[PDB]
RNA sequence: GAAACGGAAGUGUUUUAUUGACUUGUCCAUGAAAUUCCAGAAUCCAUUGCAUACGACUUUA
RNA sequence: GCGAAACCACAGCCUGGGGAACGGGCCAGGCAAAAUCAGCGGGG
RNA sequence: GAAGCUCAGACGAGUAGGCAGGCGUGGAGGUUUGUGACGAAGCCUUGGGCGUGAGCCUGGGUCGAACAGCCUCUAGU
RNA sequence: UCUAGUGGGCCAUUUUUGGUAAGCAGAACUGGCGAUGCGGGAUGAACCGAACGUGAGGUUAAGGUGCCGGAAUGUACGCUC
RNA sequence: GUACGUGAAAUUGCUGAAAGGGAAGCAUUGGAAAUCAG
């Protein structure tokens, strides 16, 4: 709980509204936020109801120049951005600057796949939803509302998980070597009465 | 590289305000690490400083500082109220303040 | 007579004035704004070219209803015209300004239009069959000149540290 | 004792920032339903008797001496017994000859002048 | 999204008219 | 020439914090020596007449206000073996500036420890160090602790840590 | 100075080599201070008619 | 090249609400990037 | 400035209406050994000061022949 | 004793009779509005607080503490897909 | 300089500074630049 320049949030298993509210409060506090893996955000309510909610959202359009009408964004990252910006005073310079401090992406791009990704417990579905309750996935609602990049993200995420697993195995082996040398070192038992 | 920072970090959140009225005479400050009013009791009376930089060189320095003092806690989540010698600008919302450890009471 | 600007000094400048000219104030302003800052020879080539319809005067401010053209692309705008009467007047004043510069004894090669301005003149009443066909004459003057281009204190603490740093150095 | 001003911004007549035929001098609104007279939010304040300053410091300049208008050497001499509380201010129509004569008279009096260097 | 055909929010005449005519209903049943 | 009223405000001695007993290791929170650790020789009327062992961290005999001092739970260093009554407010008095007509690089060359600083003051400081070093040499880690400097880091909460 | 790897926005990663450094690992000696109570191109002119109210466009030059 | 007039508190996007008169100013949203040209007349 | 000084307490929306005290303009009588070609009035000003306010003084620039404070009177204020 | 301005109307309250698919109409009192700014109810002539000199500090009313929005994504027990 | 005492405002041109995504104006607090003052 210390002020970092950039917080990378792995949005897997989170709730859209709860994560948006927490992020919107951090941006007004003046913190750069990168919400990666937005195709895994969870929304309460069963999938058919959520798709009806979204398909009702498409209905809002101008009767003159739908080019000026409401802009319906189908990407899961843009869905999260719409949720976040609705919780911000974006009509003012403060809120407009706050939006510039948020980077919502699909998947985990290489500039952010090699950085620690914290999670928000106040938005996690496992901790915040009663078991036995129906929910949906934004990355699934997006595919059946118009989003057309689901397959590429899934493929590029399988590659990323494979590479990350290889990296962790190498780091775990090095950590095992360091861990083995730990008790071999003597001061770790000689004067460890301080609790370390 | 790490032998300094005798201060703790803070953010200038907003003016002490109602829904439609703001009072710039006192500001709201969120100290890093402080998460309750009883913890804010320690930081009461400490000297908070707002450090910014400007273009024109005065006294051979780019850095200007505005002093302040933590007065009372604000809410339950650890935020406090701060009073400065000059009221902080409204464009510093979310900027970083440095709460020093003096005047110490321990 | 005193002009709108501090220059017209004898050091580098030459003066020219025309008052109560039967030229439109809006067109005169466009020509003056275009030629301001140009070299004297470059201005002569420009005005001759505007006369011959090879380049055009961009209409920046008074651009209501002005047609578009390709000849304005050299100024980054689309509305340009060829006001010949304003060009004739400006050419005459520029010739007079050059003659005054030669009389003063300036270097003709470095001369540029430092300050050119157009002001409205007393309106002239004429009748229309009832309403008025008011004329808008212009006062134009030209100034051509050859182109030419920390005491902070230290506190006791500040200087003592600075002296200590110098001693370490 | 020090000097305290309750307000520094002067009261501008309503809509004097919108019209030039309307002067900057304060005029009390008379309309029954006008927002200024009914004193709604975010409206320019009206001159109130509560806005007055401390009597012990009222009319006093920042240095504490009340300015007294002076035209001739006689007016300078009248501030002999009040030099600690009044400061001579030279009238704007006093010629250069009387100005230098007056200013040295005040300097010999030990009376402060608020427009001496002019 | 509302996800409704009829808005759940009410107009000020409509909300005021309930207290107008709900009280009269109690007057009538009395 | 009005006579002001007799103020009924009398001067009474300071009640210092009980934790600031002489012989305690403390951190400077301000000044040129911020973060340094020092041994409190005694308590003056308002401030603390304190010095870090100059042969250890090079902190001379200085006063520090008790509100800019972090008292530690580090074991006490004996100071009873050295006199402290020679440290007075008049002893620490910074004479008088007597006009700001100075600082033309001459007041600053003629300053520093080479000049100004009398050889007598060096004598008391060395005498205090001579009477203090044997104690901190006997008790382990005091020499290294005093030579080091205090600083905060990530995950450090001043309202939670106890010194 | 050379090898490999990293393409999702590769914002970098490993591997070394040669050296120049500093090497708190532990134990000793020197100086700090009066900072004596916080601060090469394109366009105009010209040309084209696949285009065209004027701009623009498509060609030549 | 010459050269007007009517009109003019200020202006200028839409949706829901603003008890009414819903309006352009207020509330909540969609939105929102200079300067312009020729049309058509919806909105006064 | 007895038309003054001093101590204390309470009080403070305001239309119709009632009462009281002040700012400013033209002219008249009295006074200021009053201001002025070494610059009156007027005018401009991102200068300074005073008063809750009506308003007043002043610095700089321009300008050229008159003008103002105090107590009364008066009004095409 | 005399002397300015006004003698209207809207909203709700409790007492009755005449009433009808259905509202409704006529009385008496009471207050609020009108001469009244301020906090809240997203905003508002009639809803909840509160009657207004210029300021500093403290504390509240009504309403609130996920974000916009100052304030607990507090504690405890249930209901609901 | 006769279009002539003084020469205001509306309005206009130039220069310098600054701001500008479907209003602009104003008020409160403070920063930034400029300026004056004790």
UniProtKB/Swiss-Prot annotation, chain B:
<keyword id="KW-0687">Ribonucleoprotein</keyword>
<dbReference type="GO" id="GO:0022625">
    <property type="term" value="C:cytosolic large ribosomal subunit"/>
</dbReference>
<dbReference type="Pfam" id="PF01247">
    <property type="entry name" value="Ribosomal_L35Ae"/>
</dbReference>
<keyword id="KW-0689">Ribosomal protein</keyword>
<comment type="similarity">
    <text>Belongs to the eukaryotic ribosomal protein eL33 family.</text>
</comment>
<protein>
    <recommendedName>
        <fullName>Large ribosomal subunit protein eL33B</fullName>
    </recommendedName>
</protein>
<comment type="subunit">
    <text>Component of the large ribosomal subunit (LSU). Mature yeast ribosomes consist of a small (40S) and a large (60S) subunit. The 40S small subunit contains 1 molecule of ribosomal RNA (18S rRNA) and at least 33 different proteins. The large 60S subunit contains 3 rRNA molecules (25S, 5.8S and 5S rRNA) and at least 46 different proteins.</text>
</comment>
<dbReference type="GO" id="GO:0003735">
    <property type="term" value="F:structural constituent of ribosome"/>
</dbReference>
<keyword id="KW-0963">Cytoplasm</keyword>
<comment type="function">
    <text>Component of the ribosome, a large ribonucleoprotein complex responsible for the synthesis of proteins in the cell. The small ribosomal subunit (SSU) binds messenger RNAs (mRNAs) and translates the encoded message by selecting cognate aminoacyl-transfer RNA (tRNA) molecules. The large subunit (LSU) contains the ribosomal catalytic site termed the peptidyl transferase center (PTC), which catalyzes the formation of peptide bonds, thereby polymerizing the amino acids delivered by tRNAs into a polypeptide chain.</text>
</comment>
<dbReference type="InterPro" id="IPR038661">
    <property type="entry name" value="Ribosomal_eL33_sf"/>
</dbReference>
<dbReference type="InterPro" id="IPR009000">
    <property type="entry name" value="Transl_B-barrel_sf"/>
</dbReference>
From Swiss-Prot, chain D:
<keyword id="KW-0539">Nucleus</keyword>
<keyword id="KW-0689">Ribosomal protein</keyword>
<dbReference type="InterPro" id="IPR001515">
    <property type="entry name" value="Ribosomal_eL32"/>
</dbReference>
<comment type="similarity">
    <text>Belongs to the eukaryotic ribosomal protein eL32 family.</text>
</comment>
<dbReference type="GO" id="GO:0005634">
    <property type="term" value="C:nucleus"/>
</dbReference>
<protein>
    <recommendedName>
        <fullName>Large ribosomal subunit protein eL32A</fullName>
    </recommendedName>
</protein>
<dbReference type="GO" id="GO:0002181">
    <property type="term" value="P:cytoplasmic translation"/>
</dbReference>
<comment type="function">
    <text>Component of the ribosome, a large ribonucleoprotein complex responsible for the synthesis of proteins in the cell. The small ribosomal subunit (SSU) binds messenger RNAs (mRNAs) and translates the encoded message by selecting cognate aminoacyl-transfer RNA (tRNA) molecules. The large subunit (LSU) contains the ribosomal catalytic site termed the peptidyl transferase center (PTC), which catalyzes the formation of peptide bonds, thereby polymerizing the amino acids delivered by tRNAs into a polypeptide chain.</text>
</comment>
<dbReference type="GO" id="GO:0005829">
    <property type="term" value="C:cytosol"/>
</dbReference>
<dbReference type="InterPro" id="IPR036351">
    <property type="entry name" value="Ribosomal_eL32_sf"/>
</dbReference>
<keyword id="KW-0963">Cytoplasm</keyword>
<keyword id="KW-0687">Ribonucleoprotein</keyword>
Curated annotation (Swiss-Prot), chain E:
<protein>
    <recommendedName>
        <fullName>GTPase grn1</fullName>
    </recommendedName>
</protein>
<feature type="compositionally biased region" description="Basic and acidic residues">
    <location>
        <begin position="16"/>
        <end position="26"/>
    </location>
</feature>
<feature type="compositionally biased region" description="Basic residues">
    <location>
        <begin position="1"/>
        <end position="15"/>
    </location>
</feature>
<comment type="function">
    <text>Required for optimal growth. Required for normal processing of ribosomal pre-rRNA. Required for nuclear export of ribosomal protein rpl2501.</text>
</comment>
<comment type="similarity">
    <text>Belongs to the TRAFAC class YlqF/YawG GTPase family.</text>
</comment>
Swiss-Prot record, chain F:
<dbReference type="GO" id="GO:0030684">
    <property type="term" value="C:preribosome"/>
</dbReference>
<dbReference type="GO" id="GO:0003723">
    <property type="term" value="F:RNA binding"/>
</dbReference>
<dbReference type="GO" id="GO:0042254">
    <property type="term" value="P:ribosome biogenesis"/>
</dbReference>
<keyword id="KW-0687">Ribonucleoprotein</keyword>
<dbReference type="GO" id="GO:0005730">
    <property type="term" value="C:nucleolus"/>
</dbReference>
<keyword id="KW-0689">Ribosomal protein</keyword>
<feature type="modified residue" description="Phosphoserine">
    <location>
        <position position="73"/>
    </location>
</feature>
<feature type="modified residue" description="Phosphoserine">
    <location>
        <position position="83"/>
    </location>
</feature>
<comment type="function">
    <text>Component of the ribosome, a large ribonucleoprotein complex responsible for the synthesis of proteins in the cell. The small ribosomal subunit (SSU) binds messenger RNAs (mRNAs) and translates the encoded message by selecting cognate aminoacyl-transfer RNA (tRNA) molecules. The large subunit (LSU) contains the ribosomal catalytic site termed the peptidyl transferase center (PTC), which catalyzes the formation of peptide bonds, thereby polymerizing the amino acids delivered by tRNAs into a polypeptide chain.</text>
</comment>
<dbReference type="GO" id="GO:0022625">
    <property type="term" value="C:cytosolic large ribosomal subunit"/>
</dbReference>
<dbReference type="GO" id="GO:0003735">
    <property type="term" value="F:structural constituent of ribosome"/>
</dbReference>
<dbReference type="GO" id="GO:0005829">
    <property type="term" value="C:cytosol"/>
</dbReference>
């Amino acid at each position: 709980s210390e002020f970092q320049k950039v917080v990378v949030i792995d949005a897997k298993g989170h709730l859209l509204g709860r994560l948006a509210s927490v992020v919107a409060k951090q941006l007004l506090g003046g913190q750069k936020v990168v919400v990666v893996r937005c195709e895994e955000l969870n929304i309460s309510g069963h999938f058919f109801r959520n798709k009806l909610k979204y398909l009702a959202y498409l209905r809002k359009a101008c009767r003159y120049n739908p080019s000026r009408g409401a802009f319906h964004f189908r990407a899961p990252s843009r869905i999260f951005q719409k949720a976040v910006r609705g919780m911000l005073p974006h009509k003012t310079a403060r809120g407009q600057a706050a939006l510039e401090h948020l980077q919502a992406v699909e998947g985990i791009p290489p500039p952010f796949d090699k950085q620690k990704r914290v999670v928000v417990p106040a938005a996690l579905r496992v901790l915040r939803l009663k078991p036995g309750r129906k929910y949906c996935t934004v990355g699934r609602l997006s595919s059946e509302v118009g989003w057309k990049y689901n397959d590429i993200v899934a493929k590029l995420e399988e590659r990323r998980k494979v590479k990350s697993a290889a990296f962790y195995q190498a780091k775990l082996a090095k950590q095992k070597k360091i861990a083995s040398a730990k008790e071999a070192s003597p001061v770790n038992q000689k004067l460890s009465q301080f609790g370390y | 590289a790490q032998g300094h920072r005798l201060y703790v970090k803070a953010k200038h959140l907003s003016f002490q305000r109602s829904k439609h009225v703001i009072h710039p005479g006192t500001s709201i400050v969120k100290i890093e690490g402080c998460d309750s009013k009883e913890e804010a009791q320690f930081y009461l009376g400490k000297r908070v400083c707002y450090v910014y930089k400007s273009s024109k060189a005065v006294r051979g320095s780019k850095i200007r500082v505005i002093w302040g003092t933590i007065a009372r806690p604000h809410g339950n989540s650890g935020a406090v109220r701060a009073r400065f010698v000059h009221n902080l600008p409204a464009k510093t919302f979310g900027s970083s303040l440095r709460v020093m450890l003096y005047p110490s009471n321990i | 007579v005193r002009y709108s600007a501090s220059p017209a000094l004898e050091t580098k400048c030459a003066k020219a004035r025309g008052a109560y000219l039967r030229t439109h104030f809006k067109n005169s302003r466009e020509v003056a704004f275009t030629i301001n800052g140009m070299s004297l020879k470059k201005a002569f080539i420009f005005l001759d070219n505007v006369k011959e319809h090879k380049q055009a005067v961009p209409f920046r401010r008074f651009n209501g209803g002005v047609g578009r053209t390709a000849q304005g692309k050299e100024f980054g705008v689309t509305q340009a015209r060829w006001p010949v009467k304003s060009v004739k007047f400006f050419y005459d004043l520029l010739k007079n300004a050059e003659a005054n510069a030669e009389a003063k004894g300036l270097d003709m090669d470095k001369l540029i239009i430092k300050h050119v301005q157009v002001n409205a003149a007393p309106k002239q009443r004429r009748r229309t069959y009832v309403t008025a066909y008011l004329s808008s004459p212009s006062h134009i003057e030209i100034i051509v000149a050859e182109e030419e281009e920390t005491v902070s204190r230290v506190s006791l603490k500040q200087g003592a540290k600075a002296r200590n740093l110098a001693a370490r150095k | 004792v020090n000097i305290i001003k309750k307000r520094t911004k002067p009261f501008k007549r309503h809509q004097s920032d919108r019209f030039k035929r309307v002067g900057e001098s304060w005029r009390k609104p008379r309309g029954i339903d006008s927002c200024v007279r009914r004193r709604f939010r975010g409206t320019i304040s009206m001159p109130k008797i509560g806005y007055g300053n401390n009597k012990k410091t009222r009319y006093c300049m920042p240095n504490g001496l009340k300015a007294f208008l002076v035209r001739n050497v006689s007016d300078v001499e009248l501030l002999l017994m009040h030099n600690k509380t009044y400061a001579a201010e030279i009238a704007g129509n006093v010629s250069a000859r009387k100005r230098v004569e007056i200013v040295e008279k005040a300097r010999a009096l030990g009376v402060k002048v608020t427009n001496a260097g002019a | 999204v509302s996800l409704k055909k009829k808005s759940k929010r009410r107009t000020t005449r409509l909300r005021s008219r309930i207290e107008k005519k709900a009280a009269e209903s109690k007057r009538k049943q009395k | 020439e009005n006579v002001p009223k007799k103020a009924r405000k009398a001067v009474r001695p300071t009640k210092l914090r009980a934790s600031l007993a002489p012989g305690t290791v403390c951190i400077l929170l301000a000044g040129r020596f911020r973060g340094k650790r020092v041994v409190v020789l005694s308590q003056l009327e308002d401030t603390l007449v304190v010095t870090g062992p100059y042969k250890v961290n090079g902190v001379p005999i200085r006063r520090v206000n008790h509100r800019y001092v972090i008292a530690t739970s580090a074991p006490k260093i004996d100071v009873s073996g050295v006199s402290v009554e020679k440290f007075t407010k008049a002893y620490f008095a910074k004479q008088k500036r007597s006009g700001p007509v100075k600082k033309d690089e001459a007041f600053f060359a003629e300053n520093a420890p080479k000049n100004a600083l009398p050889a007598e003051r060096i004598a008391d400081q060395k005498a205090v160090d001579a009477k203090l070093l044997p104690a901190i040499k006997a008790i382990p880690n005091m020499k290294e602790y005093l030579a080091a400097s205090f600083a905060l880091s990530n995950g450090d909460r001043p309202h939670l840590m106890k010194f």
